[PDB]
């Protein structure tokens, strides 16, 4: 009911590569967890949503901000929603308003930990 459970592992994989948000949802939650034994400074994962157009600027601004800032640009207005950066055994959650989304506009989800975005991305669609 308006949520999705997603795992990021030690092989730089999310266990899903497309998310559908029911247009009847007013709020959507992602619950992210890290299986596998690698710590945050080495295999850090987050979930960040932007438009497809904005993803490259977010990833590259995020790398420039460092582990200090969970590899995101503070108050990045291109970020529709994001979790915390997590390592092995931690979990994190974000809810967001579906009013921030529109049908047929392209959203991506991705990890901004350095170089992770090449494998760790997928589509987010308002059905
Ligand atoms: Ca949270
Ligand atoms: Co990652």
Burial 99-114 (b: 16+ CB within 10 A, else e): eebeeeeebbbbbbbe
97 C-alpha to ligand 1 centroid (Å): 14
Structure determination method = X-ray
CATH superfamily of the 1-127 domain: Cupredoxins -  blue copper proteins (2.60.40.420)
Q: How far is the CA of 108 from the centre of ligand 1 (A)?
A: 20
Q: To the nearest 5 percent, what fractions of the chain are helix, strand and coil? A: 20, 35, 45
Closest ligand (CA of 83)? 1
Q: Does 111 show up as a binding residue in the annotation? A: yes
**34 belongs to an annotated ligand binding site:** no
Rounded to the nearest angstrom, the distance between the alpha carbon of 95 and the centre of ligand 1 is 8
Q: Nearest Cα to 32, choosing from 14, 11, 19? A: 14
Query: How many whole angstroms from 2 Cα to the centroid of ligand 2?
Result: 24
Type and span of the H or E element at 82: strand 81-82
CA distances from 83 to 24, 51, 103, 104 (A): 23, 16, 23, 24
The reply to whether 116 sits in an annotated binding site is yes
- The C-alpha atoms of residue 23 and residue 27 are separated, in whole angstroms, by 10
What span, in angstroms and rounded, lies between the C-alpha atoms of 57 and 30?
Answer: 22
Token code pair at residue 79? 């970020």
């Amino acid at each position: 009911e308006c949520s999705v459970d997603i795992q990021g592992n030690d092989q730089m994989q999310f266990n899903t590569n497309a998310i559908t948000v029911d247009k009847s949802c007013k709020q959507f939650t992602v619950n992210l967890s890290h299986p596998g034994n690698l710590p945050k400074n080495v295999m850090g994962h987050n979930w960040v949503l932007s438009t497809a157009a904005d993803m490259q600027g977010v990833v590259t601004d995020g790398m420039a901000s460092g582990l200090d800032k969970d590899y995101l640009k503070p108050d990045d207005s291109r970020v529709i929603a994001h979790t915390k950066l997590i390592g092995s055994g931690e979990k994190d959650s974000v809810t967001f308003d579906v009013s921030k989304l529109k049908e047929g506009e392209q959203y991506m989800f991705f990890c901004t930990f350095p170089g992770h975005s090449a494998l760790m991305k997928g589509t987010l669609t308002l059905k």
